[PDB]
Amino acid sequence: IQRTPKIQVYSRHPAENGKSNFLNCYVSGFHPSDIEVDLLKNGERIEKVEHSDLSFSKDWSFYLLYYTEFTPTEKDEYACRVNHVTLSQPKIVKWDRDM
Amino acid sequence: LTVQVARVW
Amino acid sequence: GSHSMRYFYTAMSRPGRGEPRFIAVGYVDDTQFVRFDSDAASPRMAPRAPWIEQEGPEYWDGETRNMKASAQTYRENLRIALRYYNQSEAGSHIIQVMYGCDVGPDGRLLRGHNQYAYDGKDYIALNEDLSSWTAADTAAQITQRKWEAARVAEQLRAYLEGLCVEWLRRYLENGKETLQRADPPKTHVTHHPISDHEATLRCWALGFYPAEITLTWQRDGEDQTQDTELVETRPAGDRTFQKWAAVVVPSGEEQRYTCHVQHEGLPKPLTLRWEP
The missing domain is CATH 3.30.500.10 (MHC class I-like antigen recognition-like)
Incomplete structure (x- = not known):
């Protein structure tokens, strides 16, 4: 029995163009623990992405926070790409400044 | 502080 | 506590x-x-x-x-x-x-x-x-x-x-x-039209610690549990947490909706509405 990840893409602080910020991708509710997470800038993989230490919730499902420093603009599009054994194909969630 | 011994199943 | x-x-x-x-x-x-x-x-x-x-x-x-x-x-x-x-x-x-x-x-x-x-x-x-x-x-x-x-x-x-x-x-x-x-949530309500007769009200809670929080929408003072989209509380990366709750409302009925926020950092529960 396996559980597919929930995915949220968001910024640490309220986004304003030109201001330094943190781009977050939070994956949770999944099992087993193996998971592949990329942060994308205009469709391409961001290189310096860190993540939290593996932990889990009371229902034993795992969660992880992937994050990177970034400066939002009007042009630049950001997303989180996630693969998991429960997923036949990687799942892409776009950053929506109001989500 | 962690518990000091783990138990065998 | x-x-x-x-x-x-x-x-x-x-x-x-x-x-x-x-x-x-x-x-x-x-x-x-x-x-x-x-x-x-x-x-x-x-x-x-x-x-x-x-x-x-x-x-x-x-x-x-x-x-x-x-x-x-x-x-x-x-x-x-x-x-x-x-x-x-x-x-x-x-x-x-x-x-x-x-x-x-x-x-x-x-x-x-x-x-x-x-x-x-x-x-x-x-x-x-x-x-x-x-x-x-x-x-x-x-x-x-x-x-x-x-x-x-x-x-x-x-x-x-x-x-x-x-x-x-x-x-x-x-x-x-x-x-x-305890860091209390910074809160606000956003409003986005979905169509000519429906709009999303989203109640935001940001920068709070600890993670425990209750965000609820009421319509005419009654909880909208079943019609509320509630995201999982998420870490901001700076110790604090974030959460929002959204409801879809008939246009022109926005003021019948109130967001209610409970958090340890708050002296009393907060009531918020959309402010156009």
């Missing part, structure tokens, strides 16, 4: 790719303060919060020794579980452990925890009496019999009532600046 210390172990086998990985993390409330990872270049219990850094070398060496010992035991337990469930040695499996103590304002033990899972399902758990066990299946019953024979529960009770509470109290004093500070 009330506080908790929690440790979370994950032991994951990986046939053909070396010995099972062992990861341990420790929390006080919603603040991680230590980690151990057997896959690190130099595995050791390491600090993850400022207030734990003051612990001396005997703390860090002792905890490192313990985690390496625990890692070996849980690698053994993974082999044992294969036998108990008649499973092949070809698959990857996971043992999880969570244990710790809850204390009240006076620092007295409220209750202890010591629970185990195998492949994400309940395996065995120490009951609230800290003296008996609940086993989830006939495999765990074997473990229960072993642990009853060796009187494991008494040793866990001793830890949970003693060192767990004692060290939690120590951490709370050493980290009082942050562990005993």
Whole structure:
């Protein structure tokens, strides 16, 4: 029995163009623990992405926070790409400044 | 502080 | 007010790719303060919060020794579980452990925890009496019999009532600046038309600690539980947490909706509406 990840893409602080910020991708509710997470800038993989230490919730499902420093603009599009054994194909969630 | 011994199943 | 210390172990086998990985993390409330990872270049219990850094070398060496010992035991337990469930040695499996103590304002033990899972399902758990066990299946019953024979529960009770509470109290004093500070949510309501006759009202809560929070929408003073989209509380990366709740409302009826926010950091619950 396996559980597919929930995915949220968001910024640490309220986004304003030109201001330094943190781009977050939070994956949770999944099992087993193996998971592949990329942060994308205009469709391409961001290189310096860190993540939290593996932990889990009371229902034993795992969660992880992937994050990177970034400066939002009007042009630049950001997303989180996630693969998991429960997923036949990687799942892409776009950053929506109001989500 | 962690518990000091783990138990065998 | 009330506080908790929690440790979370994950032991994951990986046939053909070396010995099972062992990861341990420790929390006080919603603040991680230590980690151990057997896959690190130099595995050791390491600090993850400022207030734990003051612990001396005997703390860090002792905890490192313990985690390496625990890692070996849980690698053994993974082999044992294969036998108990008649499973092949070809698959990857996971043992999880969570244990710790809850204390009240006076620092007295409220209750202890010591629970185990195998492949994400309940395996065995120490009951609230800290003296008996609940086993989830006939495999765990074997473990229960072993642990009853060796009187494991008494040793866990001793830890949970003693060192767990004692060290939690120590951490709370050493980290009082942050562990005993509630940051209230910064809140606002956003409004976005979906169509000519419907709009989304989204109630935001940002920058709050601890993670525990209640966000609710009411329509004419009645809870809209079933029609509210509620995202999981999420970490901002700066200790604080975020959450929102959204409802879809008929255009022109926005002022019939109120967002209600409850958080430890708030002197009284907040009521917010959209402000055009």
